[model samples]
Target: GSSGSSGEDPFQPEIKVRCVCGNSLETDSMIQCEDPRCHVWQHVGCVILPDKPMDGNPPLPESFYCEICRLTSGPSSG
Candidate 1:
């Protein structure tokens, strides 16, 4: 006998992977920012990175920083 999905049958939830684009991390290639205070991993496509090695592209920089961090650091060092 088949049952509907509406019922809760031994439900299990998967760990969430957050991003600036508000999409799943597994959906596309990702890169993490190097800022010590920041905790963000954005997708290459969303960030429009020139290098996407996993997707037939090249590797990213040794020290990667997101747009926000780049601008933030550019403006102030205090």
Candidate 2:
């Protein structure tokens, strides 16, 4: 617990569009983020672990991003 915040929740949770809902990726299609620095692919139980696959699903996003990119890039802009 080395956050050492001033009695406030400074640790922010990883934000994303489609969050891993209970190993949902293992049961649904997921767009993996294969950034050069990070090859993080999927999340399962807690939202940060890779899992297997599922049956029918949609195509993975053309532009995928991991928590690393999310934190680094912040919000999207067009």
Candidate 3:
């Protein structure tokens, strides 16, 4: 008799992982820009993205850069 989700939890904060894009981050595809100094984790879907996501799919771009780093350091710094 307690199948409601509209009510706030009595003793818990609903867990939510967020991307820099302010979007929710789900499990998997969770990757950080491969930059050594700018190590911020983010959902791959949140970034400019590659031709396809990494599912062991090797068409994946040879490199990646976060928006902040790419913007500050110029593209392809990764």
- Give me the runs in candidate 3 sitting further than 4 Å from their true place: 1-18, 24-26, 50-57, 74-78
Residues 1-78 of candidate 1: C-alpha lDDT, one tens digit per residue: 987767554665432334567776555466677765664676766765553457754556657767677667454557
- Please, what is the TM-score per model? 0.47, 0.33, 0.46
Q: Give the TM-score of candidate 1.
A: 0.47
Q: What is the lDDT of residue 74 in candidate 2?
A: 46
Indicate whether candidate 2 or candidate 3 has the larger TM-score: 3
Q: Model 3, range 1-78, lDDT digits (tens) per residue? A: 567557676797333443577876465665566677666666766664555446466643547666676678545556
Candidate 2 residue 68 Cα shift, in angstroms, is: 1.6
Candidate 1 local distance difference test against the native: 0.62
Query: What are the lDDT figures for the candidates, one per model?
Result: 0.62, 0.49, 0.60
- Greater lDDT among 1 and 3 belongs to 1
Best by TM-score: 1
Stronger candidate by TM-score (1 vs 2): 1
